[PDB]
Design a protein around this ligand. Structure first.
Ligand SMILES: Nc1ncnc2c1ncn2[C@@H]1O[C@H](COP(=O)(O)OP(=O)(O)OP(=O)(O)OP(=O)(O)OC[C@H]2O[C@@H](n3cnc4c(N)ncnc43)[C@H](O)[C@@H]2O)[C@@H](O)[C@H]1O
Lengths: 111, 115
């Protein structure tokens, strides 16, 4: 279990943007841009490297939900979606998460 | 034309060369021409979608397929210490090629914030 499991279970608070039967979107507690939120599956997939073929449409659902949340939050000028894997990827929580950052110019390289 | 007529559509149809990692009926993975990490590749749909903000609901499986292929290619390329997947959207996201692309970067420590 991780802190994101606690958030899904409503045991600790987060600023929830969207929820359905299979995912949750909420603002990141350590924002790196004026808008910075996460979309996470309710299924506990620890990291993208272990996602199974059967998870394909769920992973795409995270991206469609992230797209819709970004539009609802006014990110008309663009944004960046990020999935971190493992140590080199800087993955901070072992529950897969799609980060969405916008409201400023994002730079290159992306870390 | 299948794939559209950006540079990425030209790569899909073999009109412009690329260093291809994986190809199926839905997507293509190839190495980036301007790598920002020791390994840096792209996964693109063969269906032309200009940018993620106009993807349709019925594109869900295709987008998830880009991520599955990205993680499978990262494993085949030996990125066992990890990697970062990046989808740039529009001006603030840093997008110039208006054909959806998922970038995978690894082979070094990635930093925070991600740009
Ligand atoms: N054949 C290939 N094979 C493998 N990988 C490839 C590839 N081609 C691209 N890639 C890679 O695909 C990934 C995603 O590509 P992108 O990040 O979308 O675009 P890019 O190819 O990196 O364009 P770049 O930043 O260099 O061009 P710019 O807009 O400054 O400027 C481009 C032109 O647009 C003009 N322009 C840009 N912004 C403008 C503006 N606001 N107004 C007027 N003109 C503008 C500029 O003057 C300039 O002439 C990248 O990592 C890239 O390396």
């Amino acid at each position: 279990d991780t802190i994101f499991g606690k958030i899904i279970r409503k045991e600790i608070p987060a600023k929830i943007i969207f929820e359905d039967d299979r995912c949750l979107a909420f603002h990141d507690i350590s924002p790196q841009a004026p808008t910075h939120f996460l979309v996470i599956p309710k299924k506990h997939i620890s990291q993208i490297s272990v996602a199974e073929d059967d998870d394909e449409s769920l992973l795409g659902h995270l991206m469609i939900v992230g797209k819709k949340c970004a539009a609802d939050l006014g990110l008309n000028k663009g944004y960046r979606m990020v999935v971190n894997e493992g140590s080199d990827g800087g993955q901070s929580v072992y529950h897969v998460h799609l980060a969405v950052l916008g409201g400023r110019q994002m730079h290159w390289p992306p870390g």
